[PDB]
Each structure stands twice: as C-alpha cells, then as structure tokens.
C-alpha cells in the first residue's frame, strides 16, 4: 500500500485496490482457492513457498520492487555495528544456505513447466473393454455357430 500510493502513474490501479484488501496473509491465500479473488500481490519469499506446498496455485514470473527483509532496530542503539557483521558472516560460511534448505525449499510437488509429455496411463477400461466384451460374447456366438453346425 505504500509502494502503490507513492507512484502516481499506477494511481488508477490503486483506486481499484481499496475495495478488496485483506487483513492477513492466510486470508487472501484461502480466498484465492475459493475463486473469490483471481489474483494476489505479495512477496516472492512467501508466494514461492506457497506454490510448492498447497499444490493448486501458481506464480507468474517477473518482479517489481527488489529489496530484502532486514532486522529492524531502534535508531543509534549500540548493536548497529555488531548485528550487521555476523549476518554477513552467516552469508559467508554457508549458514543461511543450510537454513533455507532446512526450511524453505525442502518440499515440492512438481514444477509447473506445463509438460503434457507424461503419463497418466492410469485407467484402461474403454480399450480393454472391447476384448472384455469379446471374451463374453464369443462363447454365445460359438454356441449359436455350433447350433448351426448341428442343424446343417
């Protein structure tokens, strides 16, 4: 709501946003699956996780407003030089890479690259049913045929 209202050129778009906003993240995520809301705008670090677990939804590509979540501190607290170091250290010796491997990208279903080249040869009923009806009807036709053979 800050990013859209700051821009003036997107203002009409913002005027369409005032009548449908929600109060929590999970509310709109559940409301998308109930077809009350065709699209949703949020961060990539929540939507890329949500499209890998609740396996009916999808993202659509590009990004707009590139930034990163930071630790919020009060102004001029004496920790502003300490906590800014170790975070960088945690990006160096592989701690954060272990962290999102443990928590973020740990599960999938299938990446929706839209590859119809796969099976789902699960059922075979309508193609096997022709021989399943042939095996049943054949003995009756054989009985009619040998009844013809006995008469003439």
């Amino acid at each position: 709501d800050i990013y859209f209202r700051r821009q003036v050129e997107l203002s009409t778009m913002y005027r369409h946003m005032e009548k449908h906003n929600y109060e929590s993240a999970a509310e709109a995520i559940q409301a998308v699956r109930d077809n009350k809301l065709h699209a949703f705008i949020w961060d990539s670090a929540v939507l890329e996780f949500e499209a890998s677990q609740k396996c009916d939804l999808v993202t659509t590509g590009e990004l707009f407003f590139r930034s990163g979540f930071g630790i919020g501190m009060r102004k001029d607290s004496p920790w502003k030089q300490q906590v800014s170091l170790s975070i960088l250290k945690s990006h160096e010796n592989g701690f954060m890479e272990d962290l999102d491997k443990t928590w973020v990208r740990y599960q999938e279903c299938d990446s929706r690259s839209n590859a119809p080249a796969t099976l789902t040869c699960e059922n075979m009923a309508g193609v096997f049913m022709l021989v399943a009806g042939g095996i049943v009807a054949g003995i009756f036709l054989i009985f009619i045929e040998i009844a013809y053979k006995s008469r003439a």
Partner: protein, 50 residues
C-alpha cells in the same frame, strides 16, 4: 497515516511498537522502504526478493 483528525501522524501496527519503546528489535519479514528508513536503522538484508 494521519490519525485523530488532526495534524498528527502516528505509526500503526508493528513499527509503532518499535517507536514507542515496546521493543528494541524487529525480527520478522519486514521490508526495506524509503519511508521506514527515515528514522529506523536496518541491516544487510537476509535475502533478496521482490
């Protein structure tokens, strides 16, 4: 937002609890903006997203 139909702008929600002394650190998915960084110091930011 401008609250109490006057010339006062207070900060709603989470960031107001940082400004009012209810806490001293915010460890949450809190983005980096131009409006929050007027008087709230941030760090090197955990991640990169959009």
């Amino acid at each position: 937002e401008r609250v109490q139909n006057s010339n006062k702008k207070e900060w709603n929600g989470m960031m107001g609890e940082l400004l009012s002394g209810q806490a001293d650190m915010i460890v949450a998915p809190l983005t980096i903006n131009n409006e929050r960084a007027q008087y709230i110091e941030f760090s090197k930011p955990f991640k990169y997203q959009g």
